[PDB]
Design a protein around this ligand. Structure first.
Ligand SMILES: [Zn+2]
Ligand SMILES: [Zn+2]
Ligand SMILES: [Zn+2]
Lengths: 48, 164, 73, 114
């Protein structure tokens, strides 16, 4: 967390064609991994 | 003990890699082992948070920015405190720290939202509080044969009323 | 604009010949690279795969099916 | 991230991997021409866009009438005539930046005050 650039390194482990599998995987990555907070709640503001 | 000796090997490597190559090799490996015991004073190979704190301190030593932390740990920075710091956001380095507080301040500003503020006048009195801090609006609601609505909004207590 | 065009060629003696051009045809090279075919093409484009194979044509050529016209000759 | 087409037949080369020497063979799929690429970067997304504010600079902007005119100087030619207009990339999110173009030096310059 102390670096000036934040990168995540990831590779698929395997027991050809890997471009579109990686595309689908990162798409799923981007879409579905919750980080924190309850779903169906969007940007929340606080008033005084 | 494998994790013990591995952390020791990493610590001896990073302090031998310092710009101040310490001729006090036994003293600096004593620093390394005392940092090892005060580090395992958290969990001692019982929880992965030990490894996480290891990653934090190891990469902070490596980073460059900053390099001066190597000399500062070689010549001070008593490590039993640095088990219990968790305090990576306040070290290595100060310019990044200042960047962090200004980022946090801007985030806190952007969190709190709309604050429309209801421009007033002083002519009418409140329907309930009866004081003159009255704010209004104009628009016409019903059909064309009549004028606007003359909406009212008190601000001494928040009352609403209307005038024809 | 085949009508508006008109031809002028210098001949070997220097004769400038006067031909009203009638039509123009555009030619494209074809099957220079062993084109695939309709049916297995349909099985490829059907939504059975998240993506079709990257080197599918090269794999079919290594199998040997659908050679070039020059290769058939 | 740009596309390189097969010179032998105008189709973009595709990424495919050397199975033994481990190199980026941009191979044609139409024909069998192959090409070694330069960098391991292949795919590129850019989830956040912030570009386009100076769009459509044609060589003869000054021929339009409806652009306004002002009196700032071109800091290449110092001619007092110039033409300014709003940022072109119409998002809900853009700024009040004015882009000044002068007819004399045919040169663009902004008025940012950061
Ligand atoms: Zn009131
Ligand atoms: Zn080709
Ligand atoms: Zn100028």
């Amino acid at each position: 967390d102390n670096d000036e650039k934040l990168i995540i390194r990831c590779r698929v482990v395997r027991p050809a064609e890997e471009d579109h599998m990686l595309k689908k995987i990162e798409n799923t990555m981007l879409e579905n991994i919750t980080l924190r907070g309850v779903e169906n709640i969007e940007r929340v503001v606080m008033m005084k | 003990h494998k994790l013990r000796d591995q952390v020791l090997k990493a610590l001896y490597d990073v302090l031998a890699k310092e710009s101040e190559h310490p001729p006090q090799s036994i003293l600096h490996t004593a620093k390394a082992i005392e940092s090892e015991m005060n580090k395992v004073n958290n969990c001692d190979t019982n929880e992965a948070a030990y490894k996480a704190r290891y990653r934090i301190i190891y990469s902070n030593v490596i980073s460059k920015n900053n390099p001066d932390l190597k000399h500062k740990i070689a010549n001070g920075d008593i490590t039993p405190e640095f088990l219990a710091t968790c305090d990576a956001k306040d070290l290595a380095p100060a310019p990044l720290k200042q960047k962090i507080e200004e980022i946090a301040k801007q985030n806190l500003y952007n969190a709190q939202g709309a604050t429309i503020e209801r421009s007033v006048t002083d002519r009418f009195t409140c329907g309930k509080c009866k004081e003159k801090k009255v704010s209004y609006y104009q628009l016409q609601t019903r059909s064309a044969d009549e004028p606007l609505t003359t909406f009212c909004t008190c601000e001494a207590c928040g009352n609403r009323w209307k005038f024809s | 604009n085949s009508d508006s065009y008109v031809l002028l060629s210098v001949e070997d003696d220097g004769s400038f010949t006067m031909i009203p051009a009638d039509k123009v045809y555009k030619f494209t090279a074809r099957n220079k690279y062993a084109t695939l075919t309709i049916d297995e093409a349909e099985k490829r484009m059907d939504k059975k795969s998240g993506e079709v194979p990257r080197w599918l044509m090269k794999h079919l050529d290594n199998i040997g099916t659908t050679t070039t016209r020059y290769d058939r000759t | 991230t740009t596309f390189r087409f097969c010179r032998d037949c105008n189709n973009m080369l595709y990424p495919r991997e050397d199975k033994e020497n481990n190199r980026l063979l941009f191979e044609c799929r139409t024909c069998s021409y192959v090409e070694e690429a330069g960098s391991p970067l292949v795919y590129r997304h850019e989830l956040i866009t912030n570009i386009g504010e100076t769009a459509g600079v044609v060589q003869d902007i000054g021929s339009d009438p409806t652009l306004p005119r002002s009196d700032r100087e071109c800091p290449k030619c110092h001619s007092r005539e110039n033409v300014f207009f709003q940022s072109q990339q119409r998002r809900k999110d853009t700024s009040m930046v004015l882009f000044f173009v002068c007819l004399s030096c045919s040169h663009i310059f902004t008025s940012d005050q950061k």
